C-alpha cells in the first residue's frame, strides 16, 4: 500500500524551454536488499507506455541524452533541460519495490498554444458481467525462463490512471494484487511461450484495457521495458 505523489499533474511548456517534474512517496521505497526500484514512463494518447528510466538516476537505452532522475530518500524528480516533439505525452513515475506497487497518478505534459523483441497479446474481449476471461500474452526474441526476467500486468483505466495487477516469475512464482480479491489466477504455455492472465466475476469497473509488460534482467533492475499493444475489456 504505497501511494506515489500526483506531481504536478499539468504541465504546458513551450518548445526548447527547460522542464521538471517530481515523484514524492508516502513511506521509504528503499527496498530489503538496500535498492530502490523507481522508474519513469511515458504515454503517448495513442500508444503503450514506454520507459524513460531504470534505478532512479539510471536511464533506459535509446532514451535521449537529456533525462535526469533526480530522486534521493522519499523524494523524486526528472528534469528534462530541451524540449522537443517527441518529448510530448504522459509522464507516469512507478516504484518496483515494496509489495504491491504503484505509479502516480502521472503528469500530462502538453504543448501551450497561442502566437528485436516483441510481446503480442490476445484480441478485444466484451462479455456480460459476471463472466470469466482469459487473454494471452505471447512473447518473442528471448526466452521466458531465463534468470532474472518475468512478466508482469498492468490495466489502465481512462480517467483513473494506472493501476498494476499481477506478476510471474520466470521460476513460475506468481503474485497477485491484493485490491483484485484474488480473483485472478495467471497461467503460462511454456511450450509457445504464451502468458495467460484469467479474471473471474467481472463487473463494470473491470472494464479497461489491459496491457502485458515484461520486467526486465538484472541488467535493467527489473523494469518494464518492453511492452504489450495491449487488450481491450469490455462489460455489458
Known amino acids: 500500500d504505497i501511494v506515489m505523489t500526483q506531481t504536478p499533474s499539468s504541465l504546458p511548456v513551450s518548445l526548447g524551454d527547460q522542464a521538471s517534474i517530481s515523484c514524492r512517496s508516502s513511506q521509504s521505497i528503499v527496498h530489503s536488499n538496500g535498492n530502490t526500484y523507481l522508474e ?3 504515454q503517448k494518447p495513442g500508444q503503450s507506455p514506454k520507459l ?3 534505478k532512479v538516476s539510471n536511464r533506459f537505452s535509446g ?20 524540449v522537443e516533439a517527441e518529448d510530448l505525452g504522459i509522464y507516469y513515475c512507478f516504484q518496483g ?27 478485444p474481449e466484451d462479455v456480460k458481467p459476471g463472466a470469466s476471461v482469459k487473454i494471452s500474452c505471447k512473447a518473442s526474441g ?19 490512471g494506472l493501476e498494476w495487477l499481477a506478476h510471474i516469475y520466470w521460476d513460475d512464482d ?63
Open 40 to 42: 519513469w514512463y511515458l
Open 52 to 54: 524513460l528510466i531504470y
Open 63 to 82: 532514451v535521449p541524452d537529456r533525462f535526469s532522475g533526480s530522486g534521493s530518500g522519499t523524494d523524486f524528480t526528472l528534469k528534462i533541460s530541451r
Open 97 to 123: 519495490s515494496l509489495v504491491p506497487p504503484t505509479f502516480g497518478a502521472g503528469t500530462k505534459l502538453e504543448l501551450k498554444r497561442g502566437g528485436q523483441v516483441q510481446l503480442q497479446q490476445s484480441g
Open 142 to 160: 528471448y526466452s521466458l525462463t531465463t534468470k532474472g526476467m518475468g512478466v508482469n500486468w498492468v490495466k489502465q483505466s481512462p480517467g483513473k
Open 174 to 236: 506468481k503474485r497477485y494484487n491484493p485490491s483484485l480479491k484474488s480473483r485472478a489466477t495467471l497461467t503460462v504455455d511454456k511450450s509457445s511461450s504464451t502468458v495467460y492472465l484469467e479474471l473471474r466475476s467481472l463487473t463494470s469497473e473491470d472494464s479497461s484495457v489491459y496491457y502485458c509488460a515484461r520486467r526486465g534482467g538484472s541488467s535493467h533492475y527489473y523494469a518494464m521495458d518492453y511492452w504489450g499493444q495491449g487488450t481491450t475489456v469490455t462489460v455489458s
